[PDB]
Design a protein around this ligand. Structure first.
Ligand SMILES: [Fe+3]
Ligand SMILES: [Fe+3]
Ligand SMILES: [Fe+3]
Ligand SMILES: [Fe+3]
Lengths: 439, 439
């Protein structure tokens, strides 16, 4: 019943070597590629304990009694348990309570309590935290009270004396029911974002794996693009579909955006991947925004030139400017640097690129986009992110370069770990040799 | 430059025949399959007007002054405009206000105001509704007040005298800011769910197309599964990956769950698609949970047998019982039937299948799963869905059939339109011959 005949009772990440197990994860395909690349696998048990310990400590540090989580990404961080993640993002059927003493309860889908049993840090599997109109119609309120009473009892038993309960996001019916139980509702995101910002050693290992899988998937997509672009039928969607499939084949989870565009659709940026028929001798730019293997986000961006002619000089300049932008800004990264100083000292894009520059020069990343957000000086708000970088943070470093009314933009982005004494760029994906002007 | 040379200034759905347009939509692949299949296309303009008029009226009928929407699915309904939908589901950066006079405003991503300009019913494009920690850190509160003030002014101008504002779901900072402006916050979902429950003519056309694209994609997946299952390497993820790609190739959007499982991983149901290596002489069951072409959800389930042997006796019976379940239940459907009567009179599953039956026998569907939810008698809550079916509603009819401790389950489901006279099963996907006891 082993899924890997070559191993003993456990896989390299410590999970059961059992083809019929409930728990999912990276595929044999992914494991083989990582092994061949000499990547160390994370130990999931140790990873889960690390996250749980850190999240409990965050609650304690703030003087709160507990943290209640409805965002599926927070639930994933706390428990490492998935359940229809994407459905969950807009249907709040699920909840995790983590109390100050570390006691953790999940309210799951009624039918699927077994989905988090692989994590013994989840002490109970309940149901009935689904407080929205589709699931309960005109009787949300009655169950909202049942749920809030359950939270009151758990908090009485596991955080006695505490009235402060942090909540990331909760339906209005839930909010009221909790407030009626005497809780003072605190900002859960301030707790979760700052906790998730520091990755432990296994999370970094998992991220190295996800990044490799993502670059492999992207490589397949580039092969497909260069082979098929300009054949009169291949569309943006056709190319992008390769990324989707190659991600899923490696045990990835979803893609957050539609950020792949061709030709004049790259400017302005943020136009979505669609039916456009791609053309020979045009730019194609994209952003992975990918929730990949082990549920880790890999958020990188590349711009390709595909054609029999040379890219225009203005395209080469833009690309080199973009590359310079991220390499300069990345070099600012080391422990102890204050976020607003990254803002104040960032590489200056030429005037003609300023109007359409990206919404940030950097941002955190983990299970998805995460705190912090490092804004350009003209958008930065004083007092918003007054904190220093620390080892174990991971920041994506961004560049969007294009002119107002122009017919192309460049998007580049690399994913960068903060180390004990500087940074390590985790992204190894090539830059288009033609656009870089290296021919 | 036309994307479809065989056409004039517009595509068959009235959108601009322009390869370089901002607006996305179904691909030429999709339009080709639909033309061959004989399908009439929706007129998107009329569809958008129908939804808007209907939602405005819902606000008027309730005596509210406005409806404020942060759920990307409600934003999609109101405006038909997408923007990083999946990111949006857990990052509330976006909002739409619809006022009692039909005046409609969107707060979009700062960088991407152009994304909804194709819908002139969207009267303004603003920014600054992003009230969450990642985007604003310790300065959410200040923007929350700027935003709440903007909402107040709009409501003063477009719904004077109204202090009732329906909101679907909003971060706590936003809620407090709106209440500080004098609004009584009403349940937005009660408005959106009931409005979306009745599809206009163009939405029905869109859904027929989406249903065809989805069934085509599922066909590719079945082809793959039957050719490759049991080759010692093909995993659940490999098979499922085909659905992802084939959906995207036709202008689809995402998949809400991971509900495809093989062999003993189908019981209990709700185990997620993963690395499991598939086998000959086994069941593969799945649920599309698919957000497809035109952004329309197609939610159907099929169970397959793949092997050289024949299905066990208990498997064939389970399948017949399941098919009988949905066909009996479907017969209940016609305008005027009260939801709680669907519950009361539903097909009775054998004692052995009761413990693990589905969470509902039916539910609505449109842009995703939608009101109503039709529970089985033992879970139905009095006074939750006291409403009659009406023409234009669409319900999926569900069957989950398996024994406690069993080694397989059957999952079947069809998507059914409610007509003036009765029902029309939109789903034409074959049922597995061998499981049905045929050949
Ligand atoms: Fe990104
Ligand atoms: Fe990014
Ligand atoms: Fe489904
Ligand atoms: Fe369903």
């Amino acid at each position: 019943r082993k899924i890997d005949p070559s191993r003993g009772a456990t896989l390299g990440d410590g999970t059961p070597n059992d083809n019929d197990r409930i728990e999912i994860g990276p595929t044999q395909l992914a494991f083989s590629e990582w092994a061949a690349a000499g990547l160390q696998l994370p130990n999931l048990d140790r990873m889960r304990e690390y996250r749980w310990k850190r999240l409990t400590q965050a609650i304690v540090d703030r003087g709160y009694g507990g943290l209640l989580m409805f965002d599926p990404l927070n639930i994933r961080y706390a428990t490492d348990s998935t359940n229809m993640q994407l459905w969950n993002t807009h249907n709040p059927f699920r909840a995790v309570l983590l109390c100050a003493d570390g006691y953790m309860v999940i309210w799951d889908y009624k039918n699927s309590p077994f989905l988090s049993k692989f994590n013994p840090l989840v002490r109970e599997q309940r149901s009935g935290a689904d407080l929205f109109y589709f699931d309960r119609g005109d009787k949300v309120d009655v169950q909202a009270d049942v749920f809030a009473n359950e939270v009151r009892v758990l908090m009485q038993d596991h955080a006695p004396g505490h009235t402060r309960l942090a909540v990331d996001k909760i339906m209005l019916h839930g909010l009221r029911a909790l407030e009626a139980q005497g809780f003072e509702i605190m900002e859960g995101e301030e707790v979760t974002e700052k906790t998730r910002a520091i990755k432990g050693p296994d999370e970094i290992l998992a991220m190295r794996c996800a990044s490799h899988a993502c670059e492999t998937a992207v490589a397949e997509m580039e092969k497909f693009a260069r082979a098929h672009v300009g054949d009169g039928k291949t569309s943006e969607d056709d190319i992008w579909a390769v990324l989707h499939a190659e991600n899923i084949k490696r045990g990835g989870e979803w893609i957050e955006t539609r950020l792949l565009a061709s030709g004049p659709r790259t400017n302005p940026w943020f136009q979505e991947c669609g039916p456009r028929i791609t053309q020979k001798n045009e730019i194609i730019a994209f952003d992975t925004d990918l929730i990949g293997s082990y549920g880790i986000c890999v958020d990188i961006s590349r711009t390709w030139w595909i054609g029999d002619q040379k890219p225009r000089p203005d395209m080469v300049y833009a690309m080199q400017h973009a590359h310079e932008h991220i390499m300069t800004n990345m070099e600012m990264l080391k422990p102890g640097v204050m976020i607003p100083d990254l803002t104040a000292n960032c590489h200056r894009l030429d005037d003609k690129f300023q109007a359409q520059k990206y919404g940030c020069l950097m941002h955190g990343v983990g299970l998805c986009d995460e705190w912090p957000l490092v804004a350009y000086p003209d958008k930065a708000v004083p007092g918003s992110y007054d904190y220093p970088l620390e080892p174990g943070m991971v920041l994506c470093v961004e560049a969007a370069v294009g002119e107002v009314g122009g017919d192309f933009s460049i998007k580049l982005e690399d994913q960068v770990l903060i180390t004990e004494d500087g940074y390590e760029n985790l992204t190894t994906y090539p830059f288009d040799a033609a656009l870089m002007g290296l021919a």
